[PDB]
Amino acid sequence: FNILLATDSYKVTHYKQYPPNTSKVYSYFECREKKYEETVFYGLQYILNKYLKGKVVTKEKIQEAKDVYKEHFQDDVFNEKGWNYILEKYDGHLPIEIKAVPEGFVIPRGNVLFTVENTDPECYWLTNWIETILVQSWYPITVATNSREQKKILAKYLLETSGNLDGLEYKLHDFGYRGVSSQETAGIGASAHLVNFKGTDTVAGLALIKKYYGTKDPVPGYSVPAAEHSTITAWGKDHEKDAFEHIVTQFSSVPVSVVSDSYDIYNACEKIWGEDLRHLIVSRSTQAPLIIRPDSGNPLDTVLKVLEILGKKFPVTENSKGYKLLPPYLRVIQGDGVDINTLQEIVEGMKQKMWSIENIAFGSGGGLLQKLTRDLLNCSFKCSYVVTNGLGINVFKDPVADPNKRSKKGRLSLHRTPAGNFVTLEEGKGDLEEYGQDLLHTVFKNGKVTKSYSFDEIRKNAQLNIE
Amino acid sequence: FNILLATDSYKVTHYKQYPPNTSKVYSYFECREKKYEETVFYGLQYILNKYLKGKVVTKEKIQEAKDVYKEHFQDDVFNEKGWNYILEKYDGHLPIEIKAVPEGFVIPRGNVLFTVENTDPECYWLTNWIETILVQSWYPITVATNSREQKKILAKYLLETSGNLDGLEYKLHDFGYRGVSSQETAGIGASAHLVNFKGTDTVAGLALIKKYYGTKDPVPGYSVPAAEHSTITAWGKDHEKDAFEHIVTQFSSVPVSVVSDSYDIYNACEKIWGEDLRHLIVSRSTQAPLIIRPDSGNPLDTVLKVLEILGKKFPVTENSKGYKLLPPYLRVIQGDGVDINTLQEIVEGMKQKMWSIENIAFGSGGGLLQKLTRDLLNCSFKCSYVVTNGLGINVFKDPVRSKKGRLSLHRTPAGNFVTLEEGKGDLEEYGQDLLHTVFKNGKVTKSYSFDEIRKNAQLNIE
Numbered sequence A: 001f002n003i004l005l006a007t008d009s010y011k012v013t014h015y016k017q018y019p020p021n022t023s024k025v026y027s028y029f030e031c032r033e034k035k036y037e038e039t040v041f042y043g044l045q046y047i048l049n050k051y052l053k054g055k056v057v058t059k060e061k062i063q064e065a066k067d068v069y070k071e072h073f074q075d076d077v078f079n080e081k082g083w084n085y086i087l088e089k090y091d092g093h094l095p096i097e098i099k100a101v102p103e104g105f106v107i108p109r110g111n112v113l114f115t116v117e118n119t120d121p122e123c124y125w126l127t128n129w130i131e132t133i134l135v136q137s138w139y140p141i142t143v144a145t146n147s148r149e150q151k152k153i154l155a156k157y158l159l160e161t162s163g164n165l166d167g168l169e170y171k172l173h174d175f176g177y178r179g180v181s182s183q184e185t186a187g188i189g190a191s192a193h194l195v196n197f198k199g200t201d202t203v204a205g206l207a208l209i210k211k212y213y214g215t216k217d218p219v220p221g222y223s224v225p226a227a228e229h230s231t232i233t234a235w236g237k238d239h240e241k242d243a244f245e246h247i248v249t250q251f252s253s254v255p256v257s258v259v260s261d262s263y264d265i266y267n268a269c270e271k272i273w274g275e276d277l278r279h280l281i282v283s284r285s286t287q288a289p290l291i292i293r294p295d296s297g298n299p300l301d302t303v304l305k306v307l308e309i310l311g312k313k314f315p316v317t318e319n320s321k322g323y324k325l326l327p328p329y330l331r332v333i334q335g336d337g338v339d340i341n342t343l344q345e346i347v348e349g350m351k352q353k354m355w356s357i358e359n360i361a362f363g364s365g366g367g368l369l370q371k372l373t374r375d376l377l378n379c380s381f382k383c384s385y386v387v388t389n390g391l392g393i394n395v396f397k398d399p400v401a402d403p404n405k406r407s408k409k410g411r412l413s414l415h416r417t418p419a420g421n422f423v424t425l426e427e428g429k430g431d432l433e434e435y436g437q438d439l440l441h442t443v444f445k446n447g448k449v450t451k452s453y454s455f456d457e458i459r460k461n462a463q464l465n466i467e
Numbered sequence B: 001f002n003i004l005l006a007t008d009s010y011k012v013t014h015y016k017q018y019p020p021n022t023s024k025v026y027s028y029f030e031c032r033e034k035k036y037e038e039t040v041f042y043g044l045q046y047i048l049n050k051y052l053k054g055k056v057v058t059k060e061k062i063q064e065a066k067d068v069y070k071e072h073f074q075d076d077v078f079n080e081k082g083w084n085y086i087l088e089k090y091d092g093h094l095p096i097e098i099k100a101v102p103e104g105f106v107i108p109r110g111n112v113l114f115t116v117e118n119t120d121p122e123c124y125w126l127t128n129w130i131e132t133i134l135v136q137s138w139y140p141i142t143v144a145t146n147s148r149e150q151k152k153i154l155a156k157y158l159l160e161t162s163g164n165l166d167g168l169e170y171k172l173h174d175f176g177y178r179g180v181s182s183q184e185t186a187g188i189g190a191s192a193h194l195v196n197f198k199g200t201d202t203v204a205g206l207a208l209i210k211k212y213y214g215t216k217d218p219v220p221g222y223s224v225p226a227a228e229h230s231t232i233t234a235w236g237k238d239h240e241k242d243a244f245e246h247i248v249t250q251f252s253s254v255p256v257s258v259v260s261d262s263y264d265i266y267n268a269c270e271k272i273w274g275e276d277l278r279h280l281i282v283s284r285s286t287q288a289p290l291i292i293r294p295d296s297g298n299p300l301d302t303v304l305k306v307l308e309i310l311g312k313k314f315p316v317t318e319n320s321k322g323y324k325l326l327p328p329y330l331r332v333i334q335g336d337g338v339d340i341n342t343l344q345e346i347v348e349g350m351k352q353k354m355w356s357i358e359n360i361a362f363g364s365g366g367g368l369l370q371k372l373t374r375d376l377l378n379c380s381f382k383c384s385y386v387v388t389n390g391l392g393i394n395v396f397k398d399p400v401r402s403k404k405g406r407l408s409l410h411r412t413p414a415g416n417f418v419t420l421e422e423g424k425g426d427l428e429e430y431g432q433d434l435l436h437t438v439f440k441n442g443k444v445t446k447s448y449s450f451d452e453i454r455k456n457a458q459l460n461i462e
């Protein structure tokens, strides 16, 4: 990795495009206004540690970038002078300052999340150079926000159907690994799901948390053994009971997820699980239940189908709220077609049918880690303040064509008003400190991470509240 | 990176789930049929080299995995012995064979693209373990296909409005670096666009290509200097003419892109470009022209407004096909909201208002590299064949699917592509298998250069 080759190409030429005596370029990030009314600020620390901290510039990288740009542009348009200056004066450390709201904070749309500026007047071009790498925090932010929004649905419906929040943290399992664009995307997205939940299959998220954030607990995410069509079918139709028995006996002390639709769902439930192997299931611990995956079809219909047939063979009870509840050794997982919308439908549909949410857990692949863009929360990075010839300019973009909410102006700060509202103060109005302390803190300054947060602090900052 | 930590958690437990005496698990990858009739096969060589070749299993990697799984599953369900067996018997090299169609090959939907299987029967479980990393090839495949589909639209309109395809490889530029989820995605994504085009701002794609593919050319992709709002909005309302002037003069030997809707699209074009700096515009090389980025709003409407505005101030002259051409020192780039659908609208709209496509180039970000899923081309990975107790069984998941047995890929005399199921390929009626061993027991048996891939992925009309 070489930071000198980690930017949009056109930004390499920017050191030649500014008015002379430009000493300061100040830029900020927000999730612009105009269902996701608030965002979970997560992911910056990862970027800061992995790509920006310490000696990121060397003689080798300078010459490597010089050679690539020469061919790529078919012209000498690379700042060897400016980059050699960072190497000589700062030992390749970036003379930049990043200030940001604490990770895991829940912030309404249209508020500053983080700001960037150069610290040395000579490195005015550096602010826009690192824009590309920083804007990429749109992804862990979007992943964390959507994952938190799904947790709200689950919390509301588990409280409405049971009066408790039992296993809430395990009700949305991450299955996204194979559905994402890369190994790095997987790790980042999985770490972002884990901000709100404790169940993943994207092992990549565990090593990411341990390396860049840390938890007091031995792991940030958990999983259970599971049996798919590929393993069941290798046994053959006449050995489905033998398959089921082998799997459940191997995983006696922990929960086990087993597919029911390989041959015949009704027979797997009613006859195999409900008759032949019933002695092995009824014996199971509340901590180690058998989890059944439904047949393919409508996510609500298949869930409803499974619940009803299991209820014909196993003792179903009415909880404190009057909702149908399966025995503790038996649970259901819906891992087909789950996104923020279908989740709301399955849980509403279950309530209507007097079935508790205590019974069900969900799985999400592409709809949790891939079918997401910078467009969802309107993640924007704009320059708001420039110092040319000692003269400060409150820069912005207010186009008449797309009005939107438009770019903010000048130096920025985030505050929580006495009334508990988040406010972003423009044109340096925050320097008045009328609205309390600035919520943004210096996380990065001149090649050093100055402020860090453990994943536990993040989790705690991201907590659901009974307001 | 630790391959023992790069699978879906549930797959870790699979060695405890197959019937006794399971000797072979053979799986394949396909873009199942359902707009996108033909797919570009690209990206596996990268996965092979970065994650699968050489000593991938080590005693340290086994120990790290055992410790992570113990906590992750709250029990001991990790195959310590089975991984130790690969460490000792194979020097930590994976006993697997991947047979794939050549990179860059354009294959119709519903065909075998690549197959995976274990070479050692003790390692039957391995085919499932590596599914996760291998299916991730959906992404470079999808980017390369969607980018090539756009290349077909731009070829159709460049032909009808101009009679030739000069500059086709520069009509769709990559702006995707910001819009993607990670540095890794950016490089993979950008490298997949570079199969069909030569214009990129996602520098990470170049380095990937160099390391994993290679070119005869020094760089696989190219770009031009460009002026964003931030660099313009910094000079103040008063010196846009001095900003424009500073940029155009600094970048004289190369084309120059200027986003001209910072203050006024009409005035910057009519007064600034049109007259005040017209001497530094008409003087410019055809190989180094000025490129104007349209104003905000509807991408077609704004492209047309700019073209009409530039008309009433510059020499607009009809070409051989009778399409409105701009002078060769003046060009336009539409970089906002461009995707496969909007591109069609724009090029058709331009043809309708009698504007040649030589006038324009396009830039795509999120739409090119990020707004794409495994469902777009029904990218499917399935186990088709399993050998249990010496008995070869054909498996297909049929809920409320798959091809059967050992698969092969052939081109018929008529030129059709056919996937031969259940080992039928042995007979050799329809020629030779297009699937070549690209990986065996820890080594990349066959590699492709980027030049070859581009040759293979060429348009039929080129």
Ligand SMILES: O=C(Nc1ccc(CN2C(=O)c3ccccc3C2=O)cc1)[C@H]1C[C@@H]1c1cccnc1
Residues within 6 Å of the ligand: A170, A173, A174, A175, A176, A199, A201, A223, A224, A225, A226, A227, A228, A255, A257, A286, A287, A288, A289, A291, A293, A331, A332, A333, A335, A360, A361, A362, A363, B008, B010
């Ligand atoms: O279904 C699977 N796993 C599974 C099932 C269910 C769960 C959710 N759960 C818990 O954690 C838990 C803890 C204690 C009691 C009850 C539960 C409870 O119900 C968590 C994980 C894997 C096959 C599917 C998969 C994975 C990746 C890609 N494709 C498909």
Ligand SMILES: O=C(Nc1ccc(CN2C(=O)c3ccccc3C2=O)cc1)[C@H]1C[C@@H]1c1cccnc1
Residues within 6 Å of the ligand: A008, A009, A010, B170, B173, B174, B175, B176, B199, B201, B223, B224, B225, B226, B227, B228, B255, B257, B286, B287, B288, B289, B291, B293, B331, B332, B333, B335, B361, B362, B363
């Ligand atoms: O617009 C930009 N560059 C640019 C301009 C124009 C072009 C298109 N073209 C060429 O390359 C070229 C070569 C030789 C002759 C003629 C041309 C010719 O017409 C290609 C690229 C960047 C600002 C926008 C951007 C970049 C990254 C992320 N967001 C936005």
